């Protein structure tokens, strides 16, 4: 996550002080400068799993084309649920199922 300038809404690029030895987020369109909280400047994931379970909506139980199972809900122990596979559509994607209860509407696995 990256922060924005509080006065002109531009991006806050990180900057390093030679004399003070501190990491600071500074806007290049002004003189505003705010002290950085964490040193994690950049992170790149070669193999990522985000978007696998992130594709979830709160009204997925109203879809009539989705199959319905009788798996046990971990939270409220309901007897009706709706399952589907991974929303990510790469070639390496697993065939595991995500179950959605019809009362608490949370996503849970079978393992």
């Amino acid at each position: 996550s990256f922060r924005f300038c509080l006065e002109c809404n531009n991006m806050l690029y990180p900057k390093e002080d030679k004399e003070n030895q501190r990491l600071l987020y500074s806007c290049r369109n002004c003189d505003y400068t705010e002290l950085a909280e964490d040193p994690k400047v950049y992170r790149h994931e070669l193999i990522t799993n985000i978007g696998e379970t992130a594709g979830i909506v709160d009204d997925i139980g109203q879809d009539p084309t989705l199959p319905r199972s009788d798996k046990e809900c971990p939270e409220c122990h309901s007897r009706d649920c709706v399952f589907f596979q991974s929303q990510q559509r790469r070639k390496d994607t697993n065939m595991t199922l995500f179950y959605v209860c019809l009362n608490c509407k949370k996503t849970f696995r079978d393992e």
Partner: peptide, 20 residues
């Protein structure tokens, strides 16, 4: 290297002999 690498990160640490 890209085959065995999983994630790469850049950190700020102004102390050569220690770390944050």
């Amino acid at each position: 290297l890209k085959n065995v690498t999983s994630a790469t990160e850049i950190y700020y640490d102004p102390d050569p002999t220690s770390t944050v």
